[PDB]
Structure 1
Amino acid sequence: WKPDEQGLQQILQLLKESQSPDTTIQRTVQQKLEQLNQYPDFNNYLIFVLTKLKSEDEPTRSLSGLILKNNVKAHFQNFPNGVTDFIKSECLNNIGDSSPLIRATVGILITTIASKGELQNWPDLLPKLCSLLDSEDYNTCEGAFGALQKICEDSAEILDSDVLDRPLNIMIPKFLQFFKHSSPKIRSHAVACVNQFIISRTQALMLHIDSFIENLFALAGDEEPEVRKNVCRALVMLLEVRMDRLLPHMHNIVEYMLQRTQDQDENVALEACEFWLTLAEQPICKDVLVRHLPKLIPVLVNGMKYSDIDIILLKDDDTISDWNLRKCSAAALDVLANVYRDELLPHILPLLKELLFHHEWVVKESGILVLGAIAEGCMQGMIPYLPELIPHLIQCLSDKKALVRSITCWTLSRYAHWVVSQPPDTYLKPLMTELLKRILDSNKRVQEAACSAFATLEEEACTELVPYLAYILDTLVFAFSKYQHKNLLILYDAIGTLADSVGHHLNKPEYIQMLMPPLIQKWNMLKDEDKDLFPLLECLSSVATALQSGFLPYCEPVYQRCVNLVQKTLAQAMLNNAQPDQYEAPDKDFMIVALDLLSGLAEGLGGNIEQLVARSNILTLMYQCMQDKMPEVRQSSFALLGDLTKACFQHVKPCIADFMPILGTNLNPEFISVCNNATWAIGEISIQMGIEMQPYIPMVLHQLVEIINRPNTPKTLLENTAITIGRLGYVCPQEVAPMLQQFIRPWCTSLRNIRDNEEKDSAFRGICTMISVNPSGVIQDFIFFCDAVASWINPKDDLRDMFCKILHGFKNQVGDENWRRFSDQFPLPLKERLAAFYGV
């Protein structure tokens, strides 16, 4: 039990100077301070000063303890036992000191110690805390519950784990009791503690569920913010876990939450507003809320107004917090919009008229925000009003207030689809014009919005942008020489998208001369170790695909570096996997973007890439990439494989027997994108192998057939599954034809909804081949085939004839009148397609 008078005065004076106004004495004394951390006796002084030295002032005492806390955050593995126990002993004995600063300091010590040493190393803590909970003195009980809150906040799953037993069996009923304590501060702690176990649906709470709801309900109208706040969090969380026990009280909950969404306390308001988001997700919502709508919308729409503090912090990275009342309200509107569709328009429209034109800009802004927020869910019933609203918004892009120009960009972008479905001179042309001006706006936030809006518009406009390319590139490349860094991400996006939308139309010497110099500038000046390459190479993978042979001037150095990036990454992984202590783990993103650039490189160049592939280790590398533990890396490698298979199969063919085992084991639909690119690859390969695919059919086909009949499977994955089955059937009809029955339905349903293209052509040659081989595969579901055949606008002649031989085949097989009875199912446009295009 050592104080030591020599060492005592040495630290007391070193604590003094660590409170000095100037940094010169501060930073040198802090250096000279925790460098005394070498001694195993040092941290004992610190607790002693905090708890046992009454002769010293509280600021000094408090600080000494906080330094001791910072000596557990870092340097706790090097803690001696007797020290640790003695600090633990002095804390629990003083957990509720009469001085609030000392009480709080001792508080956070207990919180950090019991955090760093998980909670096997203080098994005396929890039982002693629950004991100190029934304490006759307030300060002790307040101090205990306060540590119990932080502990619950830090180690919820650790307390629900087996690692310390299941002490929640007794703590849940214990906390619930203090819901009725007369102090507001205690009640707060109690609900906060219980709140930490709602989501994980902790069993200890689920048997006390009703008495939990009861206690909470009795606390709902508590006048103390913190309590109201914590009740709101609980009710909200409880919507996701125990919606059964909330349904009978639902209308009372919602009415309460409306009273709470406009709470006089900002925190409560925000926590209440969460309710509408969560509720919006439950399938019940659609009919439980209809009656509350004319009261909810105005509450949301008023919350979407910029809180005046936002105005000044907007107009370092000048940004508001991730999560606001405004944002939450806007989010809830967007989700409710998607739940009610047009049925929400009567509730909102009157408000829009009032807001959009309003003279105060803060109000106008929120109107434009609303207009964008409802855009997705309320689209079909918004269209009638759009020939007036768009030209209005286009004018607002010139409003003097920057934040108005901001959302106007966004809101227009949310109606981009409609805009392009119109004669371009009246809506698309002027929108584009003002957006281009705005991309170069003096305001950072406006550029961000304008550039994004333009990107959205480009996806929607496509080739309708071709005539305007000279102007577009001019401003995009200028922005390139101006845009800071955050905005550069968006700008790269806008260019890649440009290229994706216009494709080959970008391949003109005048456009290349504009677009390429600045990208090469960026290229040459960034180092291989620099993460600014990510958005660059990603951008280039789009530009290369679009430029096609216009890219030849640049292709070799580009191909050269991508292979290097892939090689330096794999190599770094093995020097890490065999020697973690010496070599650091590589960032796999370098490898991803390099694979991706290689992709768009094979796609833009086709057969011209072959010489670059022949004199490279790309295949050997790719084969390693396809085995990476990271799915995103497998994903990119399969896309590249599909591409090279198309570009230069002669260099891939030797590897097929090696590749196919890997592709075959990556048809797990839990990994959507990996599965997708594997399936696409298997397809392209099969076209190149021809009859030689025969060995692999039994290895993949049934996986594909399971996937295509699997519910809740994304539509594009379904699409490539359909394509690849088709392509496997084209080359191995004998092997694939017998499954005809098992895939024809979703195959047709999937492929009837895609544009006529080469892959669609590829797949239908297959389905046709399999049909002439196994006609009985389609007999039972021939209607699906007819509808899929009809989904074609302009089929090639031979394909059109193949469709025709088969249709007449069955008509002339089943009979004259037999066809009529079967054709009576056809919707009008179908019955009339087959008769006009194929002669029934």
Structure 2
Amino acid sequence: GSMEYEWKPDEQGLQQILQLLKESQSPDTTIQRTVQQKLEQLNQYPDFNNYLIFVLTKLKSEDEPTRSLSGLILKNNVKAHFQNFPNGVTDFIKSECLNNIGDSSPLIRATVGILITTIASKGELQNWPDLLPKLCSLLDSEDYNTCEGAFGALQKICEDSAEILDLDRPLNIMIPKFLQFFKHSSPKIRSHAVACVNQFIISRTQALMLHIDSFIENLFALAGDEEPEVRKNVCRALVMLLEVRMHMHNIVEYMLQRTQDQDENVALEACEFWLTLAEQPICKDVLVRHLPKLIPVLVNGMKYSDIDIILLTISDWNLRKCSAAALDVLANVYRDELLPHILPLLKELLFHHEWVVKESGILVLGAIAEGCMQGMIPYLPELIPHLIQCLSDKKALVRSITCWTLSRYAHWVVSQPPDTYLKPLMTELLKRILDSNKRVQEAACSAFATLEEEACTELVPYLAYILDTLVFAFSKYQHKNLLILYDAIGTLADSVGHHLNKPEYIQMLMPPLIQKWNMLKDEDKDLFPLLECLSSVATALQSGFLPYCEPVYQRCVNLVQKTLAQAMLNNAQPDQYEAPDKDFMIVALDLLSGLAEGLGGNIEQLVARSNILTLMYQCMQDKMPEVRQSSFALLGDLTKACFQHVKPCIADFMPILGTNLNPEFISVCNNATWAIGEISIQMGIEMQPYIPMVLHQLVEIINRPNTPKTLLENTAITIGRLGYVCPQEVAPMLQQFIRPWCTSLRNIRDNEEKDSAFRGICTMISVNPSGVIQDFIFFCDAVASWINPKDDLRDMFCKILHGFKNQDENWRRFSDQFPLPLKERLAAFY
């Protein structure tokens, strides 16, 4: 009795909708494409969705391929167009979907379930607030399909939306009910519970840390459960808890015994545990014992599955990748200390005949290279040739993995004679780069890139064959590997530097890049790598690139102009104008950057008669850090190129860099900092006024923990130059910045930047000598960094530095505290 309610449609649209569904099930394809569009077009009503769900709930006298299809098209009508949703009509969807879930038919259960989940995750958890309490009340079990359906709905809801739940904070009452179903008889319910709870563990919410003590104790009881899903969610829970928590004695045996499970998915869910463990500092003194059982298991998984060989695409994270990664982080934890565990296996598999295993062996060699590098060197002189000859294999996977794994020992290959190792590697590598198989081209290129990156100037004599084969591949490649070809040539010019500047090498390399240059338009995204490629090439061709400087420079300035214009338009009126892709600015600037770094003063004629400085001053204020990074880099290159044109704009530049000194934008800060450096050595004494704005930030930056060494080096050079030109304003900070300055300035070459930096510090010390005394050790340390100093600089060190030593009794007790080689190098050199 009491009170009730319901909804009733009419015989109007039900017949037409039923004909549209019965014909929307037609075996023809044109009928599906027609009727499905007509139904996605008959949504202009507020009542239509109540028609569909009326077919789902009350139309109990109709075949299920029609009912479930109606509910599914309702799913798409809510998930798709939900802004024009009638609220009162959707109420019927809420009540009917909520109360008709325990239907005995599994199909209706599944479609209603996905209706509830899509209504929740697409309709948010706010507008409908009586859903979760009624689901949790319906969760107290009855028959079977009821609590299982509402439970699964809570699984997909808790899998999608999770943070938002942290309804009077209801999760406190959720966990015990899960625990009530945590010791359930049916395995599926439990597998739903574990996966339900596994979402709120990495988020380390405040509701679980109270009900966790017995939670995990109970979690261990599901160790011997048979349903692969239960093992999946449980092992998942342990892997996730390994990151935010520190029974380790038997869990290692359960996991290692479970790593060889019959299901590769579950074995993966248990395989991430080794990554999460090897990341934490606990793995050092807990994992070491039972390893000889672990290593072969990993190698047992590192072979390609029977499934994956046929799809060659592959997935993106498998037991293969997870095993290789686990072996990676473990090798990085142990360094040379894992040779015994593996070496017999390598000696075996590396010379097998069934290649499916040999591939695994070569991959394992690639997996321990970075980790166990120092202990692997002695075995190498025989290892590489077997890989060299392995490059001549006929099967593709072994050839490619030979390219990459062979590429991983680029240092030892290039740190030995060339005609012995580097020449044959380059030869065969180039011969397999021109392959009929795609992955061999891409992986062989991405191996050549590393080979040049570690080889550098050793590639000068062979540039004819290198460029010949690489441009043969240029005209012979496709598109997805062409990006990596641009990578290879860019890394080339970056590696072999100026020695590229020969007219016939230009005749090999430049005609195709000019063809690709001419055929492409400005709105084509493929210009992103090309310019970048040319950028590095513009660094190497130097003055030989003069005949083509005008058009390239012009096109870059134009691109910048257009992009900035569009930016302004989107800034003034979003609803009418378009927003641009600012990736066009950076790359352009990069080229311009590189252009200066290739031509120097030869760019003069171009920089004056082109309103480009103003464009830079407009770029340096944008929102994305990338354009400030690249724009400041260009500012440095232009400052060292020509300063007769930049001088006035300097007045409006230094304040910008005054606010662009921020470590949160590392990629920018360095460049910004570097700019000031190249400014000071050009501004001379004129650099005087702008000091108090940049200096007090720079010194605070140079004494920071967890700071990249490149930023401390460019900051060091900047402070040095600011001191060389403005010693009276920079000098008093010596007690405050002298420590990490020379502490970090030990890992540099000897040219001009370090020279002007040490001139600056020498003038600043001659002007304020009181600052460095208590830390003078460090200074002497830095003085041990010079191998070829100039005459005047040498005099600067030996004369005054001699003054400190001449004022002879205490410099022994104070001197014999740092190593002898530097001691007698300073004592004999200065």
The TM-score normalised by the length of structure 2 is: 0.98
Shift of 1:105: 0.2
Task: Kindly provide the CA deviation profile for residues 406-455 of structure 1, in whole angstroms up to 9, marking residues without a partner as x.
Answer: 01111121100111111111111111111111211221111111111111
Task: Kindly provide the CA deviation profile for residues 58-87 of structure 1, in whole angstroms up to 9, marking residues without a partner as x.
Answer: 011100110010001111111112210001
Q: Determine if contact 1:19/1:26 at 8 Å carries over to the other structure.
A: yes
Q: Determine if contact 1:176/1:194 at 8 Å carries over to the other structure.
A: no
Shift of 1:741: 2.0
Shift of 1:755: 1.6
Tell me the distance in 1 between the aligned counterparts of 2:47 and 2:90: 11
Shift of 1:50: 1.0
Shift of 1:630: 0.4
Shift of 1:781: 2.1
Shift of 1:747: 1.3
Q: Determine if contact 1:626/1:633 at 8 Å carries over to the other structure.
A: yes
> Do residues 93 (structure 1) and 99 (structure 2) align?
yes
Tell me the distance in 2 between the aligned counterparts of 1:765 and 1:471: 45
Shift of 1:633: 1.1
Tell me the distance in 2 between the aligned counterparts of 1:370 and 1:706: 46
Report the secondary structure of 2:178's partner residue: helix
Higher helix share: 1
Report the secondary structure of 2:468's partner residue: helix
Tell me the distance in 1 between the aligned counterparts of 2:178 and 2:565: 55
Task: Kindly provide the CA deviation profile for residues 754-796 of structure 1, in whole angstroms up to 9, marking residues without a partner as x.
Answer: 1223211221111111121122222222222222122222222
> Which residue of structure 2 lines up, in the alignment, with residue 193 of structure 1?
196
Tell me the distance in 2 between the aligned counterparts of 1:10 and 1:137: 37
Tell me the distance in 1 between the aligned counterparts of 2:268 and 2:649: 58
Report the secondary structure of 1:38's partner residue: coil
Shift of 1:259: 1.5
Selected match of 2:481 from 476, 479, 487: 487
Task: Kindly provide the CA deviation profile for residues 390-415 of structure 1, in whole angstroms up to 9, marking residues without a partner as x.
Answer: 11111111112111110111112110
Bigger Cα displacement from structure 2, 798-807 vs 142-151: 798-807
Q: Determine if contact 1:667/1:678 at 8 Å carries over to the other structure.
A: yes
Shift of 1:526: 1.3
Shift of 1:734: 1.2
Shift of 1:194: 0.6
Task: Kindly provide the CA deviation profile for residues 285-339 of structure 1, in whole angstroms up to 9, marking residues without a partner as x.
Answer: 111111121111111111111112221211xxxx311101000000011111011
> Which residue of structure 2 lines up, in the alignment, with residue 511 of structure 1?
505
Tell me the distance in 2 between the aligned counterparts of 1:172 and 1:166: 12
Tell me the distance in 1 between the aligned counterparts of 2:333 and 2:376: 15
Bigger Cα displacement from structure 2, 188-197 vs 564-573: 564-573
Shift of 1:670: 1.7
Task: Kindly provide the CA deviation profile for residues 490-518 of structure 1, in whole angstroms up to 9, marking residues without a partner as x.
Answer: 11011011101111101110111111111
Bigger Cα displacement from structure 2, 786-795 vs 143-152: 786-795
Aligned residue runs from structure 1 range 234-383, under 5 A: 234-243=237-246, 249-314=247-312, 319-383=313-377
Shift of 1:3: 2.1
Tell me the distance in 1 between the aligned counterparts of 2:320 and 2:449: 25
Tell me the distance in 1 between the aligned counterparts of 2:424 and 2:546: 36
Shift of 1:153: 1.1
Shift of 1:834: 1.4
Shift of 1:54: 1.1
Task: Calculate percent identity across the aligned residue pairs.
Answer: 100
Report the secondary structure of 1:467's partner residue: coil
Shift of 1:578: 2.1
Shift of 1:93: 1.2
Task: Kindly provide the CA deviation profile for residues 692-719 of structure 1, in whole angstroms up to 9, marking residues without a partner as x.
Answer: 2222222122222122221111111111
Selected match of 2:560 from 543, 549, 566: 566
Tell me the distance in 2 between the aligned counterparts of 1:793 and 1:349: 42
Tell me the distance in 1 between the aligned counterparts of 2:379 and 2:552: 49
Q: Determine if contact 1:270/1:328 at 8 Å carries over to the other structure.
A: yes
Shift of 1:744: 2.0
Tell me the distance in 1 between the aligned counterparts of 2:790 and 2:545: 31
Shift of 1:222: 1.1
Shift of 1:242: 2.0
| C-alpha RMSD of matched pairs (Å) | 1.2
Shift of 1:177: 2.3
Tell me the distance in 2 between the aligned counterparts of 1:197 and 1:660: 49
Q: Determine if contact 1:65/1:109 at 8 Å carries over to the other structure.
A: yes
Bigger Cα displacement from structure 2, 124-133 vs 684-693: 684-693
Q: Determine if contact 1:149/1:192 at 8 Å carries over to the other structure.
A: yes
Shift of 1:264: 1.1
Tell me the distance in 1 between the aligned counterparts of 2:504 and 2:226: 70
Shift of 1:835: 3.0
Tell me the distance in 1 between the aligned counterparts of 2:127 and 2:379: 67
4+ runs deviating over 4 angstroms: none
Tell me the distance in 2 between the aligned counterparts of 1:120 and 1:640: 50
Tell me the distance in 2 between the aligned counterparts of 1:313 and 1:798: 68
Bigger Cα displacement from structure 2, 18-27 vs 230-239: 18-27
Report the secondary structure of 1:554's partner residue: helix
Tell me the distance in 1 between the aligned counterparts of 2:180 and 2:534: 63
Pick closer, same or farther for the CA change 1:409–1:578 going to 2, 3 Å. same
Shift of 1:26: 1.4
Structure 2 stretches lacking a partner, 5+ long: 1-6
Tell me the distance in 2 between the aligned counterparts of 1:576 and 1:802: 57
Tell me the distance in 2 between the aligned counterparts of 1:303 and 1:811: 65
Report the secondary structure of 1:342's partner residue: coil
Task: Kindly provide the CA deviation profile for residues 73-128 of structure 1, in whole angstroms up to 9, marking residues without a partner as x.
Answer: 11111111221000111111111210111000000111111112211111010000
Pick closer, same or farther for the CA change 1:588–1:165 going to 2, 3 Å. farther
Structure 1 stretches lacking a partner, 5+ long: 244-248
Task: Kindly provide the CA deviation profile for residues 41-62 of structure 1, in whole angstroms up to 9, marking residues without a partner as x.
Answer: 2111100111111111001110
Shift of 1:545: 1.0
Task: Kindly provide the CA deviation profile for residues 239-290 of structure 1, in whole angstroms up to 9, marking residues without a partner as x.
Answer: 11122xxxxx112222211112111112111111000011111011111111
> Do residues 8 (structure 1) and 20 (structure 2) align?
no
Report the secondary structure of 1:290's partner residue: coil
Tell me the distance in 2 between the aligned counterparts of 1:261 and 1:587: 46
Task: Kindly provide the CA deviation profile for residues 673-707 of structure 1, in whole angstroms up to 9, marking residues without a partner as x.
Answer: 11111111111111111112222222122222122
Tell me the distance in 2 between the aligned counterparts of 1:251 and 1:447: 47
Tell me the distance in 1 between the aligned counterparts of 2:328 and 2:439: 22
Tell me the distance in 2 between the aligned counterparts of 1:65 and 1:511: 67
Q: Determine if contact 1:148/1:193 at 8 Å carries over to the other structure.
A: yes
Selected match of 2:446 from 442, 446, 452: 452
> Which residue of structure 2 lines up, in the alignment, with residue 499 of structure 1?
493
Aligned residue runs from structure 1 range 752-831, under 5 A: 752-813=746-807, 816-831=808-823
Shift of 1:819: 2.3
Shift of 1:523: 1.1
Shift of 1:826: 2.6
The TM-score normalised by the length of structure 1 is: 0.96
Tell me the distance in 2 between the aligned counterparts of 1:749 and 1:301: 44
Shift of 1:575: 1.4
Tell me the distance in 1 between the aligned counterparts of 2:446 and 2:237: 38
